[PDB]
Design a protein around this ligand. Structure first.
Ligand SMILES: Nc1ncnc2c1ncn2[C@@H]1O[C@H](COP(=O)(O)OP(=O)(O)O)[C@@H](O)[C@H]1O
Ligand SMILES: Nc1ncnc2c1ncn2[C@@H]1O[C@H](COP(=O)(O)OP(=O)(O)O)[C@@H](O)[C@H]1O
Ligand SMILES: Nc1ncnc2c1ncn2[C@@H]1O[C@H](COP(=O)(O)OP(=O)(O)O)[C@@H](O)[C@H]1O
Ligand SMILES: [Mg+2]
Ligand SMILES: [Mg+2]
Ligand SMILES: [Mg+2]
Lengths: 164, 370, 370, 370
């Protein structure tokens, strides 16, 4: 294991998982999809302010929340992710969050082992999360069908406001 | 501003906001403690698992339902499920939006008192209300007249409701529901060579009953067809890889709804309790109750249950009277639909029990208000 | 600061520090007393020889294994091997770094008690722990779900492990391992004109089995090819200078892993014990255990054992289920890899049994802790 | 004139005529194929060995039980055992005297159909009947009211029976029986240094459990006495000449009857299934079922099982109710006693299914008749 989580990531997770009554002007700067990284010393899990996605922009500048999210992941390094999905099932309409474990083969072993052995140190602190998505290849995470296959399987008819 | 409606059913928990068509949160209401020691160290092993995470890890868990036939047996896991569906599923706080709870009629007052106490002390909601599942399932129908056949996973109850005034003296309650059907299917599937003993396995039988069971138009001729040929048998794909061949069990275990003598109950089937309650009702409202039999719940989703209910009722009711069985295609969540259409009503917004009203009254305000 | 992990196996002793990839100390676990009087005077003749010095001087020694099928038969030579691998091989003291010992499941408690007593009384370690070889070999795989096929030199055992909770009621143990294969090869090599009776020679047969034996995809067709032509025969360079020509023995002695009736055992082969243990497991975890059969140990290093294991399991398992046989290229030391990756974990650092905890508890703390 | 009663149990076959007290034919129900080639020529080597001849020659055989937990797995050896107990043990023909077969409740219909087909086609009996083991074990008690705790070698089942009308909706079935106890004893005896892997050896463990195992009044204090001193340990004389020293295993493996979590089962122990079935029964018959808990089968022969069953039931049942545990000294064969006392009854002589009744009905008459 080793690497632990900081207070900022826990605060961001508690902010995203549990939403409250908010003003219409402030509700547009909520966090939609945020990644997690390591510092220079590789001892804390920190979110990078550079790569991120707001809830406000979704549906405006970002035509596709998932489509613009695949290219945001660097293919030469290992990354964490937290995607808030809004998929439509035949049965009903659900809105859950997804934990994406991005780990390409082109990344060095020093960044793969650290992020693989410390996955239980971050996933345990994220209470109440259910949908786990482990992705290693880029083609498997780039496809849109895999998210509906992991979330609900064949039952998910529409993903992110558009049919499959 | 918006109000939460939480149908804390015996088998599923339909939770969602008000003013929308479909419930966003749907999951089985079971908690699972880890059965084995757990040699592996780390990875986030937890003390409990609620809902879909329990369904996925049901192999190493010991699933159990906190709600029996409508009464809440265990309270710690019930409030745990409430906290889960509030925080880890909807990601909202109860302190902001008012919550709406549902229950079955002829319910012990201790259950409603504990519900109110948990909602007002642990979560500190601004306001709440405890409605009836059948009344809300009738709201979802858009009409106000007709008896409701509400049968979920733990209790089946019927309450006739006229043009706004319901009849509390004719409220029938039957402890026969989907859980009893699943138990009977497990008991009758051992005669084919498939033993389901453990709780985790029992969910496989539950899905088999959900997607392979139907109610016959009549029992005798369907048995005669079952006896002769395999034209009726159908195979199922088990999660382990094996296949099973069920025959008369496709329509024998749903017959318990109409013949309770299979699981041993002495209660009249769901086709006779409705007729007895209508015959206990007033003689002028019977003409309107006969042609309006609103069905709801997941147990009323068998293919052909509407036709058999019809046939049985016109067999019991006089010939001149016409029988109609309203079978909506969204009757699995009709209680939640009614709760959501009820929470948006302006006239109802005044009768929520509030904390300021709750302080001096204690946990006994719910009986006098609701 | 660093922790020692010592895989005291039946055939090899993999000992090394924590946090590194490969074990630095690897040698056979045998002690050799001098067989002959020793006329020459001086030169440093010793009472015993451990490991590589015994392998080099095996001509005049009488090699013997202190560990049978997992149980430690003799204790003086076992603690001698421990002192050797601690001082003459690693050049470190046990009083500074904590040691980690491994063992097979379904092990007599006396063995673990004597292990703890020897480690705490003779060496006086600050802390230690007794893990399971198969659980550690699963750690080395990086995953948490899947049954483990651990087969070393003395014991073959299988324990299915789900997403952190293992199933102790399905732990199968088979006394068939590499030593039995070597004995069978010695018994069937006499039919070609090569007699191996003595322990020292038996090591030559062990190396022959290590670098010339493979498991066939199927027994019948490979025998048909063995029967017809010498296309299968291959020669070997003996240390004495002679050459041998082995034929069907290249795939007959490894077949004992799947057909124990050759050495006389009545136990189901390694391909049937796994299926019987999975069929004894829960019905929801079978889908995940079928596609995860982690193999480890030196006996699983035969060319083609993975393909035969696959074929046999999909022959036993249902057709719709998919079978996967994880065959890592470092599965010979997978137990040590898992121990080393386990010792670096921060959460595990709290559950070491310490001397201060050991004093009042006696040698019985190991059963309640581990 | 006389009728044959054949209790084809999972571990023993009690076969005898009607109207007598004790069964004349008692032997284990296993068949043994010769394991080794058999170099000696002649002497009457046979393809199979059934019963006592298999028990005597179990060294060179591979024993196996045709009956699992109640279902008959293999049919050729089952009809072979039937032919044996009919001809080589009783020296009578089935064509003359009617036969009476027994079975456990919640049994697959295929087993009973194959039983009827084998009895009517291969042996051509004039008449037969398939009763229930627990109902007959209650007949042997001379009374008609009380729940039956029938636990043999493969299945443990409980059926409450009132003053002639039994309750089929409260029939509980537990797959935990003597075979599972023997497996658990074999698994926990390896911790002392005694490995029992093969089927032939397993019979030695079976006899050890039969004549050295007891059930404790409570688990905790007996463990405390086991932990301190050897006052509890007792030695056993093995057939090979060696002696073993078992300690807490004398009362740990019988505890599985009350705590199924040892072998991994999730089912409630035998002390909780009875209480749950009585609580599923009617509220007026509970007073009569609490004071009548008829026990039968060989598994209920442990010293002290009656006292623990009592204590547990009065711990579960209300205080005002009095609990009685009828522990007859011939409860090992109570099923056969009931069958023999049942076959002599004049009223029962009319409901035998006969060949003339069987012809047009086929093998499906047994479900509608019995
Ligand atoms: N398609 C279906 N066909 C038959 N039965 C079903 C189907 N879907 C669900 N059920 C049954 O309905 C039950 C769910 O009842 P539900 O309506 O959720 O009760 P509540 O509203 O009290 O939660 C399940 O136990 C299941 O057995
Ligand atoms: N390349 C190989 N091919 C086949 N068998 C091998 C090979 N290398 C080692 N073995 C066998 O594996 C055994 C070593 O088992 P090992 O994994 O050391 O058990 P443990 O982990 O209990 O010490 C040796 O006895 C040898 O017969
Ligand atoms: N004296 C005894 N003490 C404890 N257990 C016994 C004793 N005698 C027999 N048993 C157990 O009872 C089992 C026999 O069960 P049995 O009553 O023959 O079942 P069935 O009636 O179905 O044949 C044996 O497997 C044995 O383990
Ligand atoms: Mg309901
Ligand atoms: Mg090993
Ligand atoms: Mg019996």
């Amino acid at each position: 294991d080793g690497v632990a989580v900081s207070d900022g990531v826990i605060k961001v997770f508690n902010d995203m998982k549990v939403r409250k009554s908010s003003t219409p002007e402030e509700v547009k700067k909520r966090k939609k999809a945020v990644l997690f990284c390591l510092s220079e010393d590789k001892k804390n899990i920190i979110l990078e302010e550079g790569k991120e996605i707001l809830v406000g922009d979704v549906g405006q500048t970002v035509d596709d929340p998932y489509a613009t999210f695949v290219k945001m992941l660097p293919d030469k390094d290992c990354r964490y992710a937290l995607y808030d999905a809004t998929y439509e099932t035949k049965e009903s309409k659900k809105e859950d969050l997804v934990f994406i474990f991005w780990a390409p083969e082109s990344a060095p072993l020093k960044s793969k082992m650290i992020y693989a052995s410390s996955k239980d140190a971050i996933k345990k602190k994220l209470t109440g999360i259910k949908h786990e998505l482990q992705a290693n290849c880029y083609e498997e995470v780039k496809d849109r069908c895999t998210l509906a296959e992991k979330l609900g399987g064949s039952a998910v008819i529409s993903l992110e406001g558009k049919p499959l | 501003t918006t109000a939460l409606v939480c149908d804390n059913g015996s088998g599923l928990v339909k939770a969602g906001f008000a003013g929308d068509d479909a419930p966003r949160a749907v999951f089985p209401s079971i908690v699972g403690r880890p059965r084995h020691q757990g040699v592996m160290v780390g990875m986030g092993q937890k003390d409990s698992y609620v809902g879909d995470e329990a369904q996925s890890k049901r192999g190493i868990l010991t699933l159990k339902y906190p709600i029996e036939h409508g009464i809440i047996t265990n309270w710690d896991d019930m409030e745990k499920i409430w906290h889960h569906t509030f925080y880890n599923e909807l990601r909202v706080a109860p302190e902001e939006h008012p919550t709406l709870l549902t229950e079955a009629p002829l319910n012990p007052k201790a259950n409603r008192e504990k519900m109110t106490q948990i909602m007002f002390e642990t979560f500190n909601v601004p306001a709440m209300y405890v409605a009836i599942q059948a009344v809300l399932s009738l709201y979802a129908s858009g009409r106000t007249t007709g008896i409701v056949l509400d049968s979920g996973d733990g209790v089946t109850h019927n309450v006739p409701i006229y043009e706004g005034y319901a009849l509390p003296h004719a409220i029938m309650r039957l402890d026969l529901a989907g859980r009893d059907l699943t138990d009977y299917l497990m008991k009758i599937l051992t005669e084919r060579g498939y033993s389901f003993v453990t709780t985790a396995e029992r969910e496989i039988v539950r899905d088999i009953k959900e997607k392979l069971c139907y109610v016959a138009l009549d029992f005798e001729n369907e048995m005669a067809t079952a006896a002769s040929s395999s034209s009726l048998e159908k195979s199922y794909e088990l999660p382990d890889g094996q296949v099973i061949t069920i025959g008369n069990e496709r329509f024998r275990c749903p017959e318990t709804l109409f013949q309770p003598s299979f699981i041993g109950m002495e209660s009249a089937g769901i086709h006779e309790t409705t007729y007895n309650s209508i015959m206990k009702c007033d003689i002028d409202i019977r003409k309107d109750l006969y042609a309006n039999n609103v069905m709801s719940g997941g147990t009323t989703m068998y293919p052909g249950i509407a036709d058999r209910m019809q046939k049985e009722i016109t067999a019991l009711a006089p010939s001149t009277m016409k029988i109609k069985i309203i079978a909506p295609p969204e009757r699995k969540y009709s209680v939640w639909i009614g709760g959501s259409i009820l929470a948006s009503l302006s006239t109802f917004q005044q009768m929520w029990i509030t904390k300021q009203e709750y302080d001096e009254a204690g946990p006994s305000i719910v009986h006098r208000k609701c």
